[PDB]
Design a protein around this ligand. Sequence first.
Ligand SMILES: NC(=O)C1=CN([C@@H]2O[C@H](COP(=O)(O)OP(=O)(O)OC[C@H]3O[C@@H](n4cnc5c(N)ncnc54)[C@H](O)[C@@H]3O)[C@@H](O)[C@H]2O)C=CC1
Ligand SMILES: NC(=O)C1=CN([C@@H]2O[C@H](COP(=O)(O)OP(=O)(O)OC[C@H]3O[C@@H](n4cnc5c(N)ncnc54)[C@H](O)[C@@H]3O)[C@@H](O)[C@H]2O)C=CC1
Lengths: 312, 338
Amino acid sequence: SRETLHQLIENKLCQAGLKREHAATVAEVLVYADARGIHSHGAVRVEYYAERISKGGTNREPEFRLEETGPCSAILHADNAAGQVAAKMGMEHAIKTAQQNGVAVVGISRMGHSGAISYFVQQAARAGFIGISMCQSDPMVVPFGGAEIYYGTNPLAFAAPGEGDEILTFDMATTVQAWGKVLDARSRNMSIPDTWAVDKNGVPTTDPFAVHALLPAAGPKGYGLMMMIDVLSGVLLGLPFGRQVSSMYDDLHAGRNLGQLHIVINPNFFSSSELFRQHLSQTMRELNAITPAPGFNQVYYPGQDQDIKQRK
Amino acid sequence: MKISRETLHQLIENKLCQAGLKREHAATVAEVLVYADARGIHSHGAVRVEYYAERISKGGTNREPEFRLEETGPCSAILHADNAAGQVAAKMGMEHAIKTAQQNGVAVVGISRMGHSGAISYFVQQAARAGFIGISMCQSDPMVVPFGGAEIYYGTNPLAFAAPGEGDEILTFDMATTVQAWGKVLDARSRNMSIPDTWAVDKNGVPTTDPFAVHALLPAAGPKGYGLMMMIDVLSGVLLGLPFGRQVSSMYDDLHAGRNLGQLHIVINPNFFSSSELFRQHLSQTMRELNAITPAPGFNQVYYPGQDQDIKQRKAAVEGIEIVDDIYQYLISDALYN
Ligand SMILES: NC(=O)C1=CN([C@@H]2O[C@H](COP(=O)(O)OP(=O)(O)OC[C@H]3O[C@@H](n4cnc5c(N)ncnc54)[C@H](O)[C@@H]3O)[C@@H](O)[C@H]2O)C=CC1
Ligand SMILES: NC(=O)C1=CN([C@@H]2O[C@H](COP(=O)(O)OP(=O)(O)OC[C@H]3O[C@@H](n4cnc5c(N)ncnc54)[C@H](O)[C@@H]3O)[C@@H](O)[C@H]2O)C=CC1
């Protein structure tokens, strides 16, 4: 069960170094990923996290400092704490701030990997607000037209509340595919589609063992989106940016120094929250009623495929 | 033909003024249009004036809007635009966003009930010129199938971003959420070429190479563009209590009726997070480093995002802006439309 795995991972990470409360938080986010089929960011990471913690490449005793910079802005100085802990804490502050003052823009400064980041925007939506989040990731992607890596798979996530317990959740890597698909096609020795990745010369490739770098989604569009995310979650916070961003296997003894940015918007500072939620539910219904194209059994609203996998 | 920036501005300004816009409003509309043309975004340039003139004439764009700025919090506002010209409403709202982020760090400003606002990167460039990060997005005419779908719901719903580098350097990025903007289907309609099958679908949701058989556009990157246009509809439409999704008006529904569109600006003042000087240095460093990346076979250069358009804008300052001669002919003429 869910509370089973939480207890497992909570225990394992608590003994590898983390305060019990920190272990409980990382556990939760990891399960969340596997359940929604986001396996690249689920348990395939758990022994690894345990290692980095034991070796100090993730801070077991971070000195957190939430620095408020304005009525609707803050930086959580996270001291290279586990990303799941840091990002969750900053989102709690963003939610509190948007609750009172309407909007919140909160940077997470110096954290480890934070995982399937839709977890954090769901926090905002469960509180009745719109959540947007994005973060830097290991340099892994060619600029459009390029043969050298610069940005990472730099994800973007969004959630908004509908009626009752309904939430619409959207989450995407800015590459054609997440990296975890390249490794999957490496392990099963499959070939990969030629739209996913390039070789050491920047030429598209079908051999996942000849992959030097991922391609950006929609060419120049994914390129701009990952740039935007690097500027918003990295440059804005004065952190390393672009190619300077650390990679997971550079040094298990050193903090990652990653950044993440949350933006939270309280609907009642703009219009009726009741009608907002009614209209989100209406969006979800209407999209579901759309005539599917040949080949599709249904049209899903964004994220519904994951919402479904979750409950099964 | 190529033409100056000041002259095109004047032509557009006069033509919209005689349609019935206040000269102040017609000026603002004109500079956003010339901005688009200079950057090569011609589908949102002077080509739209004749349409605008008709809508203004027939009352579908408010020539006497009662603007009302409703401040809802320290960093939030709605500009009620009373179906004023979008370029006017969006710029006014961005001026408020800039002022708000200057004093309070961040601003989220809705433009509620406006006409078409054009190449929306104009508005984020305002923020970047003021030293801030600008993000903007707006609803558009239903024209796009959901991923997996065969009926239209969302529009080409654009997203734009700009941030300042050192000096007058700005990094500007601006995209429709479809594989291609609608103008590419219109352009290949004008010259009778088959389009690739990744752009659009027929009435049945089957991808098509026949531009006259196109019923709807496809979202960029499948479900990703789908999610992005939904996000933009939610942020610039649902959030403002406006018509959303398939309810959004289309350009030729009713020329006598206000469009009721929505747009959302988000402005972030880097000074509220870290040194704005080092921020600008790092944006300029980003642009340099991306330019120095080894190009892949086929390419002669790696561009930083938006650099292709910056180059066009730079060239247009030298040689002048290229527009279709037919548009020049209409702008000098005494005809408002037809
Ligand atoms: N350093 C980090 O933390 C990173 C984390 N990630 C995460 O990994 C995950 C990667 O996601 P991707 O492979 O790009 O996702 P994807 O391509 O499978 O799907 C993207 C989005 O579209 C939705 N979607 C997909 N198919 C759909 C359909 N048929 N109908 C309606 N909606 C549909 C998904 O639910 C999801 O919200 C994300 O959770 C992302 O946050 C990714 C990169 C880096
Ligand atoms: N209702 C409205 O007002 C709407 C307005 N629009 C506008 O129409 C325009 C749509 O543009 P798209 O067709 O998506 O543009 P696009 O596909 O040509 O390019 C998108 C972005 O990527 C950049 N880019 C493209 N190729 C590049 C390269 N090789 N290197 C570096 N950067 C590159 C562009 O400069 C641009 O910033 C936008 O200005 C948008 O604001 C679009 C839809 C609706």
